[PDB]
Amino acid sequence: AVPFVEDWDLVQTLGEGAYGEVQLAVNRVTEEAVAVKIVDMKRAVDCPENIKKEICINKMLNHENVVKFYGHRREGNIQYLFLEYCSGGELFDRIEPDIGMPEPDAQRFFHQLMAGVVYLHGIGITHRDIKPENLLLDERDNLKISDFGLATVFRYNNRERLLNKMCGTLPYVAPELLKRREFHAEPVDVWSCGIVLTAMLAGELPWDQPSDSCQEYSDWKEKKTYLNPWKKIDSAPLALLHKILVENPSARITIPDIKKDRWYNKPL
Numbered sequence: 253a254v255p256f257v258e259d260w261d262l263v264q265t266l267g268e269g270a271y272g273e274v275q276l277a278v279n280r281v282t283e284e285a286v287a288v289k290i291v292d293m294k295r296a297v298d299c300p301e302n303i304k305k306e307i308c309i310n311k312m313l314n315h316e317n318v319v320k321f322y323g324h325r326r327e328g329n330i331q332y333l334f335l336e337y338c339s340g341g342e343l344f345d346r347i348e349p350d351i352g353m354p355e356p357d358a359q360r361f362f363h364q365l366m367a368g369v370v371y372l373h374g375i376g377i378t379h380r381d382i383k384p385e386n387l388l389l390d391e392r393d394n395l396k397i398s399d400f401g402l403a404t405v406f407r408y409n410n411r412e413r414l415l416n417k418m419c420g421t422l423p424y425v426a427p428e429l430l431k432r433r434e435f436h437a438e439p440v441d442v443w444s445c446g447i448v449l450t451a452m453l454a455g456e457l458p459w460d461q462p463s464d465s466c467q468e469y470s471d472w473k474e475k476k477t478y479l480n481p482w483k484k485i486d487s488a489p490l491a492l493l494h495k496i497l498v499e500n501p502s503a504r505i506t507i508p509d510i511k512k513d514r515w516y517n518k519p520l
């Protein structure tokens with residue numbers, strides 16, 4: 253019913269999953285509310301390490317658009333991830349199925365996702381799994397990238413480190429992850445942010461995966477915007493998508509150039 257972790261009361265479960273569980277921890281004494289991820293390590297082959305990297309990354313991260321990392325403890329098997337609480341919930345729950353959200357709100361949330369992403373990239377960290385379920389909104393309703401379990405460093409000592417490990421989520425991963433062996437880390441996140449811009453604007457996921465065979469992806473590759481979800485989207489913001497969901501990860505628009513897009517700088 254009502255458990256607790258080292259002086260903090262465990263109110264309710266914010267999220268779960270085969271990952272373990274994240275209960276909202278708050279202490280009636282100070283009453284500061286926080287997010288506590290309880291990674292239930294097992295053996296020395298899955299959880300007991302997929303978290304060593306996760307905690308390190310966090311201690312590096314500090315940006316108004318990245319769920320803050322307070323600290324961590326560790327009984328033995330059960331480890332505690334002290335994290336920032338975002339009352340707002342997930343961006344995911346602000347997308348109306350098959351409809352979306354008011355364009356101005358899409359633009360705003362996109363600015364922050366771009367803010368937080370550019371930031372991470374600056375310190376050579378790639379998220380690898382950007383999506384509405386990982387973009388939380390807080391009290392004031394500010395977007396904060398979340399869940400760094402799959403993140404990783406791609407630039408250390410100013411030297412890129414091409415990636416090859418496949419991972420993330422199918423209806424959000426960039427095409428190169430399927431056709432290539434190695435791929436630059438940054439363009440994968442830009443593509444994933446692009447797919448997130450579409451949900452916010454069409455309340456639906458373009459395709460199940462950027463597979464050259466997925467019929468819906470082939471139709472976007474054939475400028476057939478005269479169909480869903482592209483039809484529910486306005487040509488302005490659609491112009492940016494045309495530059496984001498670009499196949500060759502080399503010709504894809506770069507975060508910097510996204511800040512110079514007409515829709516992006518459109519007072520809304």
Ligand SMILES: COc1cc(-c2ccc3c(c2)NC(=O)/C3=C\c2ccc[nH]2)ccc1O
Nearest residue numbers: 266287289319336337338341398399400401
């Ligand atoms: C900074 O990096 C991380 C964030 C979270 C995380 C995951 C879920 C929530 C949260 C933080 N803070 C919250 O407030 C969360 C969930 C929620 C659900 C409804 C309101 N909030 C888990 C692992 C991480 O490595």
